[PDB]
Amino acid sequence: LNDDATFWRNARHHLVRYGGTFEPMIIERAKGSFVYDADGRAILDFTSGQMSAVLGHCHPEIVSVIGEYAGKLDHLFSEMLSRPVVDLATRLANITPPGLDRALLLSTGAESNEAAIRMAKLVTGKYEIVGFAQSWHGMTGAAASATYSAGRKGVGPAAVGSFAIPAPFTYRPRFERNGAYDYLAELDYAFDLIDRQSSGNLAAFIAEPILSSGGIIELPDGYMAALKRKCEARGMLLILDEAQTGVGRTGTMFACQRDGVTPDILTLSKTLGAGLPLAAIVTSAAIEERAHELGYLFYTTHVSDPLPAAVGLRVLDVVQRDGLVARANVMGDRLRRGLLDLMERFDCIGDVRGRGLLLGVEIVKDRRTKEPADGLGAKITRECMNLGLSMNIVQLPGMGGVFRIAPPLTVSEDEIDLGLSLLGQAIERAL
Numbered sequence: 001l002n003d004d005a006t007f008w009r010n011a012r013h014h015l016v017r018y019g020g021t022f023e024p025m026i027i028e029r030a031k032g033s034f035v036y037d038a039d040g041r042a043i044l045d046f047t048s049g050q051m052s053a054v055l056g057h058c059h060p061e062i063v064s065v066i067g068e069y070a071g072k073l074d075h076l077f078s079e080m081l082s083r084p085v086v087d088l089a090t091r092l093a094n095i096t097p098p099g100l101d102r103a104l105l106l107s108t109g110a111e112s113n114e115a116a117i118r119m120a121k122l123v124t125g126k127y128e129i130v131g132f133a134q135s136w137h138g139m140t141g142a143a144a145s146a147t148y149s150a151g152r153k154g155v156g157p158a159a160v161g162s163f164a165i166p167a168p169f170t171y172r173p174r175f176e177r178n179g180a181y182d183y184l185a186e187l188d189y190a191f192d193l194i195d196r197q198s199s200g201n202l203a204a205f206i207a208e209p210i211l212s213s214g215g216i217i218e219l220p221d222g223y224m225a226a227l228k229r230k231c232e233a234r235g236m237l238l239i240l241d242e243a244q245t246g247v248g249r250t251g252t253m254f255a256c257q258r259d260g261v262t263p264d265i266l267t268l269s270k271t272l273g274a275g276l277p278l279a280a281i282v283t284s285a286a287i288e289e290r291a292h293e294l295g296y297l298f299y300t301t302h303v304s305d306p307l308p309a310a311v312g313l314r315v316l317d318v319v320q321r322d323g324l325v326a327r328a329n330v331m332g333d334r335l336r337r338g339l340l341d342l343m344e345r346f347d348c349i350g351d352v353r354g355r356g357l358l359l360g361v362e363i364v365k366d367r368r369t370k371e372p373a374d375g376l377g378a379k380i381t382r383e384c385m386n387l388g389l390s391m392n393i394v395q396l397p398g399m400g401g402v403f404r405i406a407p408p409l410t411v412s413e414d415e416i417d418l419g420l421s422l423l424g425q426a427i428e429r430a431l
């Protein structure tokens with residue numbers, strides 16, 4: 001049973017609380033789209049772990065490559081090159097929009113955003129970084145200063161030169177031009193403001209193709225291109241942080257591929273490790289050379305470690321081979337409609353947005369009022385757990401509670417249905 005008294009005794013005894021509440025269970029096993037507690041009760045994982053396990057839990061291909069390398073090649077001196085490292089880097093150059101030629105292998109997104117930011121600063125001589133008001137780029141310094149989603153209050157000043165502009169949020173438009181939401185004009189407006197505050201040292205703009213931690217906010221048509229022109233106009237580098245959106249989760253190998261806008265630096269992590277700490281950045285050949293000329297340095301314990309590189313290269317192979325990018329769209333459209341149906345039955349569902357297998361559902365007190373649902377969201381996530389379907393809801397201000405639904409890219413048609421069902425029941429007994 002989950003109750004194991006001596007387990008929770010030790011938990012409250014020696015566990016540091018990093019914000020949030022611990023599920024009242026004990027996960028002892030995880031497979032495909034399920035995790036099991038002490039009693040063996042199966043739980044449908046509609047969060048792919050922490051937006052990671054895109055290949056599902058303990059995917060045999062990953063289990064295979066891991067053992068296969070943990071015993072042959074594991075950790076090396078940062079100065080020694082292996083085959084998993086050079087091939088992973090090569091693969092990344094090959095599957096990323098033309099222009100992105102060289103990669104750096106790290107362990108985390110925060111780490112990856114750090115790397116890209118420092119490189120942009122170095123090749124520009126500038127140090128000012130601009131991002132979105134609801135972005136989440138890690139819990140780490142240079143990557144945490146550009147994170148206005150959370151973690152900047154009560155821990156001293158932010159990082160010198162950090163600016164945030166609003167993110168284009170079509171569901172709750174707050175910038176109007178001619179009785180319409182002109183999110184592009186809203187961009188100029190935001191930038192003009194930034195220019196007056198800037199000391200002329202803008203080095204780059206960092207953005208998620210889909211702001212995950214900020215309530216699953218997708219960047220509208222033509223925005224990305226506009227953002228790019230804005231940066232080019234100011235000698236800025238555009239950095240796309242695809243830690244949760246990269247690797248086919250949104251229906252494209254890379255979400256930036258859909259807008260057709262290639263970033264100066266792309267960063268990956270969550271979905272590249274598939275539950276394993278692997279990250280990376282890819283930049284153009286020219287940028288890499290210039291940064292090299294300025295003595296660009298970024299050492300980490302695991303930079304260029306064979307094992308993580310091997311698992312990452314194997315994750316890519318599984319995604320391509322089993323065409324999981326397509327899988328994301330099919331299972332996504334299926335999940336999206338099932339959601340629109342539920343939205344057709346319950347009024348508390350104000351919006352269904354997102355893309356591929358990265359969807360969000362905002363709960364409102366009334367669809368016409370778009371008035372956030374007080375705790376209603378939490379109530380349903382609670383009912384969803386009892387029903388055996390693990391959910392995740394983010395609560396941002398001026399916005400209603402938002403469910404971030406992200407099943408594995410290996411989720412079956414039936415598992416999608418099962419989830420949809422559980423969710424519907426969750427809402428029924430939640431109201």
Ligand SMILES: *Cc1c(COP(=O)(O)O)cnc(C)c1O
Nearest residue numbers: 108109110136137138241243244
């Ligand atoms: C989750 C996330 C990160 C942080 O990854 P960590 O391993 O926790 O450092 C960075 N960027 C984005 C867009 C993320 O979603």
Ligand SMILES: [Ca+2]
Nearest residue numbers: 076078303304
């Ligand atoms: Ca190393």
Ligand code: NA
Nearest residue numbers: 093096097100
């Ligand atoms: Na490329």
